[PDB]
Amino acid sequence: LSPLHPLGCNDSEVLAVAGFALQNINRDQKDGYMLSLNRVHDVREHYQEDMGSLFYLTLDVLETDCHVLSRKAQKDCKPRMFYESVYGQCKAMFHINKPRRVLYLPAYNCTLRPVSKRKTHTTCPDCPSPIDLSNPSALEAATESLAKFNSKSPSKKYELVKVTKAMNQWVSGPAYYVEYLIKEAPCSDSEPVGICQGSTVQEKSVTVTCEFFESQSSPSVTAPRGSIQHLPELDDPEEAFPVQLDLTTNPQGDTLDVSFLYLEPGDKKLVVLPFPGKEQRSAECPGPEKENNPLVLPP
Ligand SMILES: *[C@@H]1O[C@H](CO)[C@@H](O)[C@H](O)[C@H]1NC(C)=O
Ligand SMILES: *[C@@H]1O[C@H](CO)[C@@H](O)[C@H](O)[C@H]1NC(C)=O
Numbered sequence: 346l347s348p349l350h351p352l353g354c355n356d357s358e359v360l361a362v363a364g365f366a367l368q369n370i371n372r373d374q375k376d377g378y379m380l381s382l383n384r385v386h387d388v389r390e391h392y393q394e395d396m397g398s399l400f401y402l403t404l405d406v407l408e409t410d411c412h413v414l415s416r417k418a419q420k421d422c423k424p425r426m427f428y429e430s431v432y433g434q435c436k437a438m439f440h441i442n443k444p445r446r447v448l449y450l451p452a453y454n455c456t457l458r459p460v461s462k463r464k465t466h467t468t469c470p471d472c473p474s475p476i477d478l479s480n481p482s483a484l485e486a487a488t489e490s491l492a493k494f495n496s497k498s499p500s501k502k503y504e505l506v507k508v509t510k511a512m513n514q515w516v517s518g519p520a521y522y523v524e525y526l527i528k529e530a531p532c533s534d535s536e537p538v539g540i541c542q543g544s545t546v547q548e549k550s551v552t553v554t555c556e557f558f559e560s561q562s563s564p565s566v567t568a569p570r571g572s573i574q575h576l577p578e579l580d581d582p583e584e585a586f587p588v589q590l591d592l593t594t595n596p597q598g599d600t601l602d603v604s605f606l607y608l609e610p611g612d613k614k615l616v617v618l619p620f621p622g623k624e625q626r627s628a629e630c631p632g633p634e635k636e637n638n639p640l641v642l643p644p
Pocket of ligand 2: 452453454571572574589590591592
């Protein structure tokens with residue numbers, strides 16, 4: 346819109362604010378895996394001269410192998426390898442006010458898809474393959490791996506919560522690799538306490554390892570309402586990952602009260618517009634991709 350000024354997707358301020366917004370998104374999640382920033386696809390800034398700025402960000406993201414509940418650092422979590430890749434886009438409306446040292450993510454939304462199995466097969470026909478999380482063999486691997494893990498826990502026993510990842514490959518026979526969350530068995534409540542990796546091969550041979558969540562803080566404070574949705578593969582560009590982020594459908598613009606961020610009690614209102622479309626985009630957008638390793642890139 347008229348007050349929405351486009352910015353270059355490679356600008357330091359833009360990339361820093363994008364990092365803040367994405368770590369806020371990750372903190373706001375309690376399901377799935379931590380997202381990683383590949384680049385800023387587009388960015389518009391609404392400057393408001395004492396209420397700071399509001400950035401309308403379009404982000405190209407990749408799923409890592411860290412579960413969000415691990416709360417690990419962005420630098421201990423790398424994008425998944427290409428045959429199990431999950432990618433898409435997030436839109437975020439991020440508010441920053443430098444003189445007052447205020448950060449806030451009033452709204453976001455992400456749309457992700459797993460990489461097309463056809464493209465994977467084209468580039469690596471013998472690679473491991475993701476499978477449905479409800480696959481009987483995946484559920485069996487989870488069950489038996491957790492059974493073994495409990496067998497070697499004298500006092501504490503754990504129960505399955507949900508399979509979060511499943512994969513099939515050939516290791517001198519059919520093999521299934523799964524990840525799943527575990528909770529403490531009633532003996533404390535029914536909340537995820539860790540994530541386990543389970544495996545079956547070939548009368549099956551079983552392996553199991555578990556990681557328990559610990560506390561973890563970084564340059565990002567709060568992240569209200571938003572959602573991450575997972576759509577199916579592309580059977581076969583722009584609008585491959587449709588994302589709606591409309592706090593207001595009013596071209597006039599609405600006002601959002603953010604007084605809780607500032608020391609004074611009242612009269613701190615932020616102008617919000619409908620999220621800007623792809624036209625009037627800076628020639629420096631989209632920015633340069635950070636992942637150039639084809640071992641982690643989607644086609
Ligand atoms: C992006 O900015 C960095 C400096 O932070 C520069 O080294 C790099 O060449 C830029 N890439 C562009 C403009 O594509
Ligand atoms: C975020 O996406 C959901 C659909 O997954 C949609 O219902 C919701 O309105 C979106 N949020 C905004 C602020 O538009």
